[PDB]
Amino acid sequence: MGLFAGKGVLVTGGGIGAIAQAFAREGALVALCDLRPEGKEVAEAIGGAFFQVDLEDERERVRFVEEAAYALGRVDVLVNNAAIAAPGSALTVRLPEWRRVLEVNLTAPMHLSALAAREMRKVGGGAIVNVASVQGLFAEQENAAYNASKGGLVNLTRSLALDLAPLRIRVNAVAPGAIATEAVLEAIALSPDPERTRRDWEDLHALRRLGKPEEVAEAVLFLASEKASFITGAILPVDGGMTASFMMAGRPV
Amino acid sequence: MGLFAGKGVLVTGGGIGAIAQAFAREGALVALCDLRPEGKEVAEAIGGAFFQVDLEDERERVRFVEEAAYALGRVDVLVNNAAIAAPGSALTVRLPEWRRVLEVNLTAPMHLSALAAREMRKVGGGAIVNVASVQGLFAEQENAAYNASKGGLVNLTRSLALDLAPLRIRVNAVAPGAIATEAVLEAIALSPDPERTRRDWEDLHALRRLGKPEEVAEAVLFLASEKASFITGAILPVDGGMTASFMMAGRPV
Amino acid sequence: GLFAGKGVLVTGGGIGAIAQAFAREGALVALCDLRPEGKEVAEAIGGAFFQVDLEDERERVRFVEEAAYALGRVDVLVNNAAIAAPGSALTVRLPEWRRVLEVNLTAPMHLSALAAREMRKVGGGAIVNVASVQGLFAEQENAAYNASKGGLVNLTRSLALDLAPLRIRVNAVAPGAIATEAVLEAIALSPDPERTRRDWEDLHALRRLGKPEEVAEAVLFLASEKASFITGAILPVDGGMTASFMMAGRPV
Amino acid sequence: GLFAGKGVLVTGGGIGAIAQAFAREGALVALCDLRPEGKEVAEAIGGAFFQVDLEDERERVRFVEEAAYALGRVDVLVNNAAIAAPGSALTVRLPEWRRVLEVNLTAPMHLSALAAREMRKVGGGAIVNVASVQGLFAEQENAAYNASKGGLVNLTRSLALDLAPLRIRVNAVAPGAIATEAVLEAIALSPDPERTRRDWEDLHALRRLGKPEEVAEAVLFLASEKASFITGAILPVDGGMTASFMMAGRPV
């Protein structure tokens, strides 16, 4: 019970659990969806609903919002957290994988925001938080689909903020750095030199450590709450100082 | 003769000949494409090739680069200038329109950059200039597809700059304000109060006038030239001061 | 509460929203202000007040030393004091310009360094600079403010990089038009108060002025361990103002 | 040329690239610099040289007055002089901090105003400030530079808004690491010159230092009528440095 007591919260990509747990801890009714079935454990662990959903599919996006709305009784908050990547520069990425990344990372958040918004009207407003990335504000080598899709999500965040202000819905984004999620910890483990990749990714931040999912969750939680009542259209880095430097924030040269 | 003497330049959406005439006057061999057949007049007027092309279609994009490359003998410069919009917020825009805007404004530049890049290798490098918009850096009400697609193009510009640097290809964007295109001039002319509409749009800029297409062309020209040899990944506003203010640059408080 | 037992310094705390917000979460608050009214704020919340001119480097040193002594510890510094010198570069006098830079830019740098040495004693802390959207963009005839605030924005980044090893996070909030007494008075002494209010409301997508309490919440969050992985960030608290390339609350 | 007959002022023109570039396009160039070697630049290009300390407001006034008189007209001002003071906010001395803010921030403001009064006489002109990527981002131990340059960036916006009605465009270039004699000297005085060079080259996607001539071209363009609808813009000349969230020329 507390800051989101009784409120209905939708989380796309809730399988990690940090975001879902954070809202649940504050008394929210959480509906999460994920492609991976493990998300069921997260929902059971927190007294929330789970839906196995492929956000690539527009019919499935409609079904998720409808069924989650029905399960929760209301929609107050949407968190768009699901994302994919297609490794490669524009030279090497295949068009189908590019279009899949745009569909999931950019088109799905737009669509879900519209669907969730129609529900939020019924309760007088709400908040949307899009989990972008520092990779929506800057790029890196060989990650074109991610960079383009996330860059679009950043300006989409602004679009939605302007358009949904009349419905009393705030829309913001968080732009995480390197976060110690299982995916990032496996990427490290599968890299040519895991030990050096760990040190190199820690050192992308001024704080010289990976971010924790809980730390992203707190930012999302804040932006979704009434504590952030005069904040809409904002893109908040949660990157331990990464984007404060023009080089490696945790290793100047 | 000139800064582009002998060089092969591709211009997407060149029906407004400003960009093509600018390159042509500096001695370029210009291949332009456009959906509208009027672009033929532009090509004839400047001694260049014209291709009627629908950039929405990936097969047509491949055919354009292949045939333009063959016609010109070389590719040195690509200018991605074609764009469309689908009026509406996320609440009102139809998914097919949204996907068509993303295809044309975001996917097409990515694809065309890759194709053009393989040609530029043959001549030891070159330059790409994407025409984004101030609407890729900020949003406005009821223009979600444009804002999202252009936002993506801005970060894609960065991605391409990083990835294409090793090929000695610079990639930049120009971000125009309100430009006196025939579409813009007509909207003014058909508005209930043309003098008010004009004054409002002029006053989005500190210079309190619409930009001319020729002014955008000069920015594109500069960024594509060796005069800009240490400039890559940059997004240059051509907006007479619009993005320098947090409100109307030409109409304070 | 979230700052129970912690020592919090607020420059320009005479308004009171920020001070009240930290106090409400159990903080020991030391505020300073040029205006003596800040005493009421401190009394109202069980905190210490110091009448201080932040323009003067000796007074800045004395404030941190005496506030540190009064509170027993320093965990948080909020740099909120600011002034302006109306005019473009053409009309602003150099002495006024230099006074605005001293107060808005130099004072925050200096105070951050002083506060930082005291935060080491308690294992870290947080600094929040109250910049403005006027540090990210400009407006006509406000050059000193725009320049000083622009500097504070990048100084926020500098401090974040340098103070990270000391476990001190440094962020800024960039408010839009806030219904402070200064702002409410400007409206009131306007030839058309209703029009001025409507125009400034409409700078924001939410089409209202921000409340000082709303800025306070942002400052509170950024100063707390809930922003543990947030440093070097500039957070707009501007109801969507900077999300548009024109008036966010009145498109054309 | 693009500046045939036009009067161009260049502050800290001693390096010479910018001066040469304008001269090559037919400009009458007046440059100033603290270092007497700018006389060789002025002699080499048929321009005037003034030995000037831009820290001093009286000297700034005298420069514009005398350069204006020598040239007959002022069309363009390029503010290129800058200094730095080593250290974070913890270690920088306040006197050194204030001197950087005076030369890097106050001097361009002042010089812009002075030059602007001259440009009115010929119906307008252009100002280009040489800021830095270090005005948009920071690095460790360079607080004065980061703050001053950050201020110059937003000042560039302020001036653009205020000087638009006078038909004067104001823009900035934001250079990366440029192979000036100071930068190369630092590489040489480094414990590992080869490593330092490789590191600084790799701050750019193009994986080399910029040349002063390359900055000059950007300045030249922004000052010309080819850039007629460009004002208030900040143009990186950084070979892709600010396009990445890490080292643009060395990803991890």
Ligand SMILES: Nc1ncnc2c1ncn2[C@@H]1O[C@H](CSCC[C@H](N)C(=O)O)[C@@H](O)[C@H]1O
């Ligand atoms: N199409 C899809 N449908 C549902 N969940 C998806 C999904 N694509 C990815 N996810 C989930 O979303 C999470 C990945 S996103 C991870 C954080 C951040 N948004 C990022 O961009 O990296 C995982 O839990 C993953 O399984």
Ligand SMILES: Nc1ncnc2c1ncn2[C@@H]1O[C@H](CSCC[C@H](N)C(=O)O)[C@@H](O)[C@H]1O
């Ligand atoms: N699919 C397509 N194929 C080819 N040309 C296209 C196109 N879609 C649009 N264009 C052309 O691109 C131009 C419009 S874009 C105009 C400039 C800027 N990109 C903007 O968005 O405002 C016109 O010449 C138009 O006919």
Ligand SMILES: Nc1ncnc2c1ncn2[C@@H]1O[C@H](CSCC[C@H](N)C(=O)O)[C@@H](O)[C@H]1O
């Ligand atoms: N030199 C100085 N010393 C101490 N307090 C000062 C001061 N100059 C201004 N103040 C105080 O600082 C406060 C400014 S608060 C107003 C908002 C401000 N523009 C910002 O966003 O930072 C006021 O209470 C004022 O009286």
Ligand SMILES: Nc1ncnc2c1ncn2[C@@H]1O[C@H](CSCC[C@H](N)C(=O)O)[C@@H](O)[C@H]1O
């Ligand atoms: N106070 C001053 N008066 C005049 N010239 C100065 C000066 N301080 C520095 N200069 C000169 O102006 C140039 C500045 S060197 C550094 C400039 C670079 N664009 C940067 O932003 O770091 C040099 O030629 C230097 O000798």
